[PDB]
């Protein structure tokens, strides 16, 4: 529905400019815990959909962020199973699960420590997102040096220091 | 020479305060470029030396910052062999060789292309700082690993998750 879409656009753009910056972004988003909406996670939205360097999204990339951000929010109002607006660890092995991961039980509370700002042990809406953008990319790298497909790899030291450097 | 440091630590701490913040330190270094001591470098260097997450150094926490940098200047004086304000690549070999490193030619200039904010090919002095330490905690890091002393190491995927949790 672009027509609906649009109303959107217009609400959060609130400098008029036809672009959606970070800040404006950031504003539009609760993370249900009445803080602001990761930061991080923000500009880790905006910059997968802005195709221009410009810090931001115009109409046709923001309706890409809009179904982005509709689709994680499915997702986490599914496990948030009690309305709390965050999930414990067993929902959150049962949705990474659901993603295809292969995860230790233990690993999740690693997870969970990692990615958690509120330090309560359990996820809120924001890092939820940042923590699995964050687990695609560094599984996607491990994928691709796992070449024999059995869950180890083996690198030298130049290459863990490339590997890193490609990281951060 | 504790009358000399005293001057010195008067004249950073701007505001007074007994603790030199940040941006006071940065506002007292020069890279050699007339652009900003690169900050996560200033960063870097109070975290070393504060031992109280107080985002700042009290005069006898500057008195090892000051010869920290010190230090760091007496080694790139050493092999800015034209007094231009950053070292070649030729250079850099010789120095992380003098600290013992055991790099391949060509990764001096993934080193170079990493650090290097000034885009020259070269580096600058605060630039080069960041990548010793950078290069000195990921090796650390390598070394824990290698227990056999081979240069490779072999981690699982967990293994690997965790190790860049530690990193970054
Ligand atoms: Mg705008
Ligand atoms: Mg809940
Ligand atoms: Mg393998
Ligand atoms: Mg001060
Ligand atoms: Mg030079
Ligand atoms: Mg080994």
Redesign the interface.
Known sequence: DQSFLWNVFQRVDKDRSGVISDNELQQALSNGTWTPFNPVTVRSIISMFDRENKAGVNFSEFTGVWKYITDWQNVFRTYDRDNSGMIDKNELKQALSGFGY???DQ?HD?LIR?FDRQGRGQIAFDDFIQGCIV?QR??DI?RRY?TDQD????????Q???M??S??
Chains 1, 2 share one sequence.
Do not use: A, H, P
């Open positions: 292969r995860l230790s690993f690693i990692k687990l560094l599984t491990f796992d869950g180890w790899i083996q690198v030298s030291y130049e863990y220091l490339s890193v450097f990281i951060v």
